[PDB]
């Protein structure tokens, strides 16, 4: 499923992310934009052989099991394909463990490089929330 900016925003607030661990809604939307282009089915391979899954590109090294990542953990106790559903519940819930892990949203390299220190508000501009 490919979300609209505001739809994704709406769903993310609904699922408890607005100011989750201090991170306003615009951060999560911006991160989603640059990780997956709002597309729930997005997959990409990392240089280490792990794969990134979903709307927020959650990775198999630590957070999920995809059956082909040797020497990895499954810290969100999920198969990585659960992260590609049209329902974002699993991705959000897992994002909350990641984001609560010490490094905050810096765990997402696209957040720190593209969203951090920028006007993240603009990502929710014109949405009913």
- Roughly what fraction of the amino acids lie in strands? 5-15%
Strand order, biggest sheet?
A: 1-2-3
Q: Classify the helix fraction into a percent range.
A: 25-40%
**Structural shape:** globular
Number of E strands: 3
- CATH level 1 name: Mainly Alpha
Cα separation of the termini? 21 Å
Examine the secondary-structure arrangement and name the CATH architecture: Orthogonal Bundle
Order of helices and strands: HHEEEHH
Number of separate domains:
1
The helix count comes to 4
**Biggest pleated sheet:** 3 strands, antiparallel
Measured on Cα atoms, how large is the radius of gyration? Answer: 14 Å
CATH topology: Lysozyme
| Helix-and-strand structural type | mainly alpha
Give a structural overview.
- With 129 residues, this protein is mainly alpha-helical.
- The protein has a single domain, classed as Lysozyme.
- The protein has helices at residues 5-14, 25-36, 89-99, 109-114; strands spanning 43-45, 51-53, 58-59.
- A three-stranded antiparallel sheet has the order 1-2-3.
- A hairpin with a 4-residue loop joins strand 2 and strand 3.
- The longest helix has 12 residues, at 25-36.
- The chain starts with a helix and ends in a 15-residue tail after the last helix.
- 35% of the residues are buried.
- It is classed as hydrolase.
- Keywords: protein-metallodrug interaction, CO releasing molecules, hydrolase.
- The assembly is monomeric.
- X-ray structure of the adduct formed upon reaction of lysozyme with the compound fac-[RuII(CO)3Cl2(N3-MIM), MIM=methyl-imidazole (crystals grown using ethylene glycol.
- The protein: Lysozyme C.
């Amino acid at each position: 499923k490919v979300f609209g900016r505001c739809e994704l925003a709406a769903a993310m607030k609904r699922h408890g992310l607005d100011n989750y661990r201090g991170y306003s809604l615009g951060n999560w939307v911006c991160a989603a934009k640059f990780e997956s282009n709002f597309n729930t089915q997005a997959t990409n391979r990392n240089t280490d052989g792990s794969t990134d899954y979903g709307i927020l590109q959650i990775n198999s090294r630590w957070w999920c099991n995809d059956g082909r990542t040797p020497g990895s953990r499954n810290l969100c106790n999920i198969p990585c394909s659960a992260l590609l559903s049209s329902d974002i519940t699993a991705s959000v819930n897992c994002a909350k463990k990641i984001v609560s892990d010490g490094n905050g949203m810096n765990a997402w390299v696209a957040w720190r490089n593209r969203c951090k220190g920028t006007d993240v508000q603009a990502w929710i501009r014109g949405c009913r929330l």
